[PDB]
């Protein structure tokens, strides 16, 4: 005889999630493992000889890169001698300036900073994160994709995402050969929705760089690094190849970050017996060592791995905190499905949403999750109204705003009309007036007419093989009745000339104003200081739909 209470609980979505007991020998443990090395460092003649228990004669490529470029050796011995509990206390103490902490953490070893944050509970970590976040203003990044790679829908969804507040937007492709079309549609739509939104198209690394060189992207993020040598090898890179890639992006004036995240090494089969958090700390120091300004982390695509084991979502917040504490921009995930439960995914989001990070999510789905080509995000388009309500409930700036349906329809329509003009001016397969209308009123690709995919594929690849660059898109908009959009597209390209938006946490707001950690420095010093939601931004967030007036 069964308890009907337990029958009711067995049907709950959360019991469809994947949980596992810790498996230490294969690194299936989130943090605080017995196999993790004890922090240590020895320095002779300005060169590291021992790093976290490992002598330099046993260094893998990751150890060499971190030991040579990733640690401030002038104070490493000093900071290693400090008490880890006291250091954790300094992290969440509102009266210890961010500028006083960065010289300490950047002199820590990977094991040392993991030891520091592992003394903290999630409230302490959030208290620290609101201080250690590099940019004073938090922001947000969206995915814009669909399962058909329909460029008309991408441009419309991108315009709506930019209109709702995303400052970076990311696309990806079901069919890799479509990518030039996805990149152009994303860029056009983003500039229509808000001039200055930065766009990326996530592909294999050599392919993505070439796409950037031609001018069809604004930045790149999915430049992956990994925490053990055999995993890094199967990702088709070394720390030196990825460091060279980072400098190649900058040499073309393109902003970029790395991507890592807890659980990748487990997911790819060689965790070398270490906890997810310790291996992720190696990834963060690889990023620091390469001179890359920022990092997308917080498990990202492998969220199913840490979320399966105890303290996994706390470990995800800890890896975000390590990132910001090392003075990197942190695009803090919240971009990938891990649970059937609305309660559970909300708890996971609030860890970054409440204190704020440089990008609270690094991929909120601006489309319904069925169209999300990263296999689903932790939030999607159907959550927009909940997200705004929680901003208003808690007085938290989560980067987004309530919007009017009439405005969104207009801006989606303009984005599709602008792309239609690009495709006509550049001689690409027609975008018909029926599709402009469909993209205007769509929720997702189920509302879109089918396109001739093989004709799109052929002309997308001609963009690459004939090196058709971003100036052709400017010209088409200008010859097609979109002088305003053409100018905004030109202004995005000009930002690649100044180097300004290469700096830590840089986005582009207002009338082409770069806003980075350099000129928007976080100055948190406790209550009533630091970023506060107020003024007209608060008026924007208050104005949710359905609020009845009693006057």
């Amino acid at each position: 005889m069964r308890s009907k209470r337990f029958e009711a609980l067995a049907k709950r979505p959360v019991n469809q999630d994947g949980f596992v007991k810790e498996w230490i020998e294969e690194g299936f443990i989130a943090m605080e493992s017995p196999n993790d090395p004890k922090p240590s460092i020895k320095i002779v003649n300005g060169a590291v000889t021992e790093l976290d228990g490992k002598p330099v004669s046993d260094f893998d490529l990751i150890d060499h890169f971190i030991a040579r470029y990733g640690i401030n050796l002038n104070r490493a011995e000093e900071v290693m001698a400090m008490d880890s509990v006291k250091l954790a206390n300094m992290l969440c103490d509102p009266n210890v300036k961010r500028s006083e902490i960065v010289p300490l953490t950047t002199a820590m070893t990977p094991a040392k900073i993991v030891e520091v944050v592992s003394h903290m509970n999630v409230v302490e970590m959030m208290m620290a994160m609101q201080k250690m976040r590099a940019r004073r203003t938090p922001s947000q990044q969206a995915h814009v994709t669909n399962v058909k790679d329909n460029p008309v829908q991408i441009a419309a969804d991108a315009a709506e995402g930019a209109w709702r507040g995303f400052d970076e937007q990311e696309t990806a492709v079901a069919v890799a050969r479509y990518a030039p079309f996805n990149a152009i549609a994303l860029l056009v739509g983003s500039q229509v929705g808000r001039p200055g939104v930065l766009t990326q198209c996530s592909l294999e690394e050599a392919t993505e760089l070439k796409l950037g060189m031609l001018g069809h992207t604004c930045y790149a993020e999915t430049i992956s690094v990994y925490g053990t040598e055999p995993v890094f090898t199967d990702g088709d890179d070394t720390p030196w190849s990825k460091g060279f890639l980072a400098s190649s992006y900058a040499s073309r004036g393109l902003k970029m970050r790395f991507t890592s995240g807890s659980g990748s090494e487990v997911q790819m089969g060689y965790a070398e017996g270490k906890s997810m958090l310790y291996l992720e700390a190696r990834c963060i120091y690889i990023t620091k060592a390469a001179g890359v300004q920022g990092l997308q982390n917080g498990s990202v695509s492998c969220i199913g791995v840490p979320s399966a084991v105890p303290s996994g979502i706390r470990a995800v917040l800890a890896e975000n905190l390590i990132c910001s504490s090392l003075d990197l921009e942190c695009a803090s995930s919240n971009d990938q499905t891990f649970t059937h439960s609305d309660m559970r995914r909300t708890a996971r989001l609030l860890m970054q949403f409440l204190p704020g990070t440089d990008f609270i999510s690094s991929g909120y789905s601006a489309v319904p999750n069925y169209d999300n080509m990263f296999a689903g995000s932790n939030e999607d388009a159907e959550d927009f109204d909940d997200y705004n309500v929680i901003q208003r409930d808690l007085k938290v700036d989560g980067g987004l705003r309530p919007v009017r349906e009439e405005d969104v329809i207009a801006i989606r329509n303009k984005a599709a009309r602008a792309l239609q003009a690009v495709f006509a001016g550049m001689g690409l397969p027609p975008i018909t007036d029926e599709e402009v209308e469909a993209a205007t009123y769509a929720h997702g690709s189920k509302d879109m007419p089918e396109r001739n995919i093989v004709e799109d594929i052929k002309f997308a690849q001609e963009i690459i093989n004939k090196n058709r660059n971003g100036l052709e898109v400017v010209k088409a908009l200008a010859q097609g009745g979109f002088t305003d959009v053409a100018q905004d597209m030109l202004n995005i390209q000009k930002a690649k000339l100044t180097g300004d938006y290469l700096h830590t946490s840089a986005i582009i707001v207002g009338d082409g104003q770069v806003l980075s950690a350099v000129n928007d420095v976080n100055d948190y010093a406790g209550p009533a200081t630091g970023y506060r939601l107020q003024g007209e931004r608060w008026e924007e967030i208050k104005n949710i739909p359905g609020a009845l007036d009693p006057n």
Partner: protein, 177 residues
């Protein structure tokens, strides 16, 4: 045991073949992909799809990596058409082509739990038509936002064991079905 190795694989002669390249654990450590589809069945449907389009189907095993991209690249190296199909033990599949970066592809099937034998058959049918220098309508994209929540931990565990069968330096072996 339905796969036997006849010798080290050879650079293909003619231009009307597709190489199916399977990972090292495929068909022994596990005879079934992540959702219970028999391995023998996956070959048969992919093999059938290649031949009903008028093209030969070759099958090879790879050993140097358990990663389905590097497996497939070994196939497209030896395929006289330049086209290959990489298949992992837990079911992950990719259609690859000579000249492409190892982590690029022609078509990719990156959620193994969603693959059906019908989808496997259209893969071999599309792969052959690539070998014929046609541009087939790519297999319709399969995507389920709950695939990772349900199976990603199981995928990591299954792949962890796949990596036990990797043999550094050992060249690919030819396969009779």
């Amino acid at each position: 045991g339905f796969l036997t190795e006849v010798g080290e694989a050879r650079q293909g002669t003619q231009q009307d073949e597709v190489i199916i390249a399977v990972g090292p654990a495929f068909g022994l450590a596990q005879t079934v992909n992540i959702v219970g589809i028999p391995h023998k069945s996956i070959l048969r449907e992919v093999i059938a799809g290649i031949e009903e389009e008028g093209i030969k189907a070759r099958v090879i095993r790879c050993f140097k990596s358990s990663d389905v991209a590097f497996v497939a690249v070994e196939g497209n190296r030896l395929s006289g058409s330049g086209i290959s199909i990489g298949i992992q033990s837990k079911g992950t599949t990719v259609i690859h082509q000579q000249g492409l970066p190892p982590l690029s592809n022609l078509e990719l099937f990156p959620q193994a739990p969603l693959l059906t034998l019908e989808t496997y058959r259209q893969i071999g049918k599309n792969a052959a038509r690539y070998a014929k220098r046609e541009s087939p309508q790519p297999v319709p994209t399969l995507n389920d936002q709950m695939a990772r929540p349900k199976y990603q931990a199981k995928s990591a565990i299954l792949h962890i064991k796949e990596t036990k069968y990797v043999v550094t330096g050992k060249n690919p072996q030819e396969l009779r079905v």
